[PDB]
């Protein structure tokens, strides 16, 4: 229930241990005034400092003037910080505004079309995003709600996604969570303690070509539906062949323990692990940080289920893009469909109490 | 960490309220009574496993490679998490299987209420399973696997996820707050109050339906909050709507949350004043609802509210009179009922040989 420090060279919520809940919101900007947008970013940073410490925004949730609406909507009163992190990102469409055209990073690449894509344009894209993660879903909603409230008239929520449970791990010393297909998900990721691998694969560097992005990262979000009726009638052997690890232990095929290293030549040539492994992609390595979702029924008598896939990387062109291209023949494709997509440049961290979100860009 | 599955009553009504909810309504697609009874027994066997934290059937792995696993496996490694599974039967079930003359009179159809805006697709249902647990993945796994076991005899009609408190960080003493920011649950029937449960919650033999003795009647309402409107109201407007202050949740004029309210100090259309048993001839409800937030709608608004659940001994003397009295509730400006269902919740599964619905079938 403790707090995660908000200030740093990097934004929290990436290398941070993965919290239980997610509320992800994408915003479009509705103001033409650069000064007004900068004032928004400063007000948002002040609110974030309160929220991530477990305090109410502004002058608080009650005890103010009777005739005024309260500064804070109040539904997190008496709750702990709950490891809340707030991570902001900037979408490519943002750079068509405020004269930012020449500051768009080369590494913030539009994704190509992939075979099987069925992207809903209403739940894709966005000028910016806020990723709220916490162990308490009410804490995460309270944070998104109050940020959107503060931004009234300057931003509007384009789409959002709640994740009821994590399907990722940055802490390999703790139990790996399972996704809704029943497999452990997160075994071979990047750990928050692997500072060298984060430098190599996650954090943007000044020499990469965009100095305002130094210390930041790039985010790919993909909303993926799971065909669970189809999956649930597949044999156990079929399911394990699809991934290349057994279902119970999560060990690489042939081996006894989850964390034993995969021997890829023993997996089917279209096994998901074989195709996604860095060794199959010229070393390309991602930080996966996704969550499971379910949004009711599908209207056809079935549960709706999916995975909200989030990947952080130093350069979209050398992280997600090569790996996802290599998944064109993935055996998993029979059981999933990508139905939403968005990319964002995640700026560097808020260095101290005088700093603010996006200050290196604006 | 676990709640016993067997008893005179079904768990999940008077037992401690867990952090998360997955509520599912099912429709029945078989006409064959024997097929439906077979499913009730199979579901009961699965519920026994699930509430003890075990996988269904012969498990999630280790079986024949050429067969699908009995359990879909996403709760492997998790704890029981105080999972309870509570089954209920909808009025529409009684048009099947020759049961028409066995519908309880206390299982009444609800009247239309001023301001109803019910989505038919998220209303009704032949039966329900309320899955409550501290870990939402444990709850989802239970619904997912019951639906799979039932495939061919039942389909899922609608499903709702909900959250209350997070107990690993919030004292069990503390009243949870709803998404309007007010403490919610202060004056409620507690599961410790065995006499009030007998008077207001559990169906009795003399009530007129012997197979329902020890059961209860459930009203479910999906209530949307108009969040962005509410958040633009003044603090005084918000407190006037309920009759309690927002910080402490004390009734107007008193100092502490648990002070008994003085109804005449509240505005005449204040929510607490209209809902109170003294304004409804003594009618008293067990509320066991959960908050929800499903995302944002096409206009950018928060799709959020209260998945209201009330248990009572008779729908005609519980939910209906109180909801009728809310016709003029000041809160009506900020909420809209968009989904509705009622269920007869049978008595408990008495031992390892008993099964869900045995007193009815
Ligand atoms: C519903 C969609 C997906 C499911 C169910 C899924 C499932 C899994 C599972 C069970 C593992 C093995 C355990 C682990 O090391 O994490 C894994 C590994 C991995 N997956 Fe996926 N995955 C999905 C989508 C994706 C996508 C879209 C990508 C990238 C575009 C991806 C990239 C990876 C990578 C890089 C690994 C680690 C491979 C290694 O280094 O051993 N996954 N996935
Ligand atoms: C979004 C919808 C609703 C909200 C936000 C809400 C909120 C509240 C709040 C804040 C209280 C005061 C604290 C407490 O004793 O729990 C309360 C009391 C109560 N509410 Fe509501 N309520 C809602 C809908 C309903 C409905 C539909 C009913 C019944 C049909 C109902 C019946 C009651 C009752 C019986 C009390 C106890 C009053 C007393 O005896 O003092 N509520 N509610």
Author numbering:
A (entry chain A): 55 to 416
B (entry chain B): 56 to 416
What are the paper's exact sentences on this?
Herein, we have chosen to use an extracellular dye-type heme peroxidase found in Streptomyces lividans and referred to as DtpAa. The overall structure reveals a ferredoxin-like fold typical of dye decolourizing peroxidases with two DtpAa monomers in the crystallographic asymmetric unit. Heme enzymes catalyse many essential reactions in biology and understanding their structures throughout their reaction cycles is of high interest, prompting extensive efforts made to obtain ‘intact’ structures at high resolution. A major challenge is to obtain the higher valence states of these proteins, for example peroxidases (FeIII resting state and FeIV intermediate states), as these states are phenomenally sensitive to reduction in synchrotron experiments caused by the presence of large numbers of solvated electrons or other radiolytically produced species, generated by the interaction of X-rays with the crystal.
Serial synchrotron crystallography was carried out at Diamond Light Source beamline I24 at an X-ray energy of 12.8 keV using the same chip and translation system as used for SFX at SACLA. Following each translation of the chip to bring a fresh aperture/crystal into the beam, a series of 10 ms exposures were recorded using the PILATUS3 detector in shutterless mode. We first describe an MSS experiment series comprising five dose points with a dose increment of 32.8 kGy (MSS1). The initial resolution was 1.78 Å with only a limited loss of diffracting power/resolution during the 50 ms of total exposure for each microcrystal. Dataset 1 of this series (MSS1-ds1, 32.8 kGy) reveals a six-coordinate heme with a slightly lengthened Fe—O bond at 2.48 Å compared with the SFX structure [Fig. 2(b)].
